[PDB]
Amino acid sequence: GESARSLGKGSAPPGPVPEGSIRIYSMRFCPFAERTRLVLKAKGIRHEVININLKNKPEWFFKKNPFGLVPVLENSQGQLIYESAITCEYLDEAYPGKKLLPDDPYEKACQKMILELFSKVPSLVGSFIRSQNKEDYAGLKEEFRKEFTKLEEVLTNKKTTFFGGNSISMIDYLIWPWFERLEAMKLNECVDHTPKLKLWMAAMKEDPTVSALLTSEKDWQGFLELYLQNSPEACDYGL
Template identity: 60%
Template sequence: MSALQCWEYGTVMAAKSLREGSAAPGPVPEGLIRIYSMRFCPYAQRSRLVLVAKGIQHETINVNLINKPEWFLEKAPLGLVPVLETEKGQVIYESLITCDYLDESYPGKKLTPEDPYEKAKQKMLLEHFSTVVTLLYKVFHARKTGEDLAVPEAAFREQLLKFEQLVPGDTQFLGGDSVSMVDYMIWPWFERLAPFSMGEYLNDAPKLKKWVEAMMDDPAVKELLTSPEDHKGFMELYMARDPECADFGL
């Protein structure tokens, strides 16, 4: 496989991830921004959704996060994705920061509200949702270790229903009648509920269930959607710390 097969332009999924011992990619091509990603990472998916939603021409390079290339750690001190790199060699990392950067730096529809109060409301909703994410990973961990699932699943369910109470019932999306930043920041974890039979909790959360249905029709979500089977296959390998998990399905 040639080096060029390890990344792609636009939004077509890249081929296999780069890992330890791989050659560092060259400069970012003119007119593009580069994102270092991993096909199944929900945090990287946040940035990829923004790139697609705003129609930003970009280059994607997938990185194996279990077997990281040495050069990646030089670019990304935290060793995590997403990471953006500009034509000027500027590097931006952390998912929320990269998304804000993209929204502020590129033309087209602004995903973040201009009104300070509306912007604050979205950030507060994200803060509440971070607790849901924490408990979801506790469920995944319990499944990995074979621990009793009753306690973490009950805690996850309780927090999800608390979050449901914060969801506006008079708009189609979380921030209004059109998709905005908060929708893309939260979506990746709902995409990951179905493979583990956890989507049933949405039956008790009608506002969130309606929101999920609306998000499934969003062009950016549809373009980047990963099948439940692939999500499940990845997670099973990831829980076993198999370095091939990043390339599941390729």
């Protein structure tokens, strides 16, 4: 547990990544980094995790990523990869086993076009956590419903349980983290008019990879309380 404690301002710069492993600079409750971690687990990629204290960042972390954001991958050759969707594509291409993206160019384009249908949602979740009263919350639920309707149409047309087909694939892992957070944000009723999307969330929670990385609502709550109190201890909630 204590192994997972974040590195913050003053921490020593970490040593090289061992041959045979890849390193992720992550934060345990960051949904962007959770994308990368789902791919690492889904493909069985040996890796180590460094958690960054995103309230109290080490100055050395800007040498990993000039933007100072997670996720970041670093390999034994010293190559650095950042931006969540880019880290996922890299892992899918660089490592053996189950291809999470289709080989077919059109079917891969389709997965990126769905990602684009989804692209407003992270900004709404970012706005949501700030909402202050029942009126802002009503408005926020209607904004989620309009984005969710777009995703419902994809499942309607394909009649597959997942966005890439009847098997879970990269697009499902790239959107999952924000759906994971919906219960805890009390935004669960925004899937009520999207029945295929509501079944999709149940299917996802049964996925071995999703289940293995799922955080309890309790744990996500304890985090958000500290993040919103502006606490340097938020990222190390529970230890």
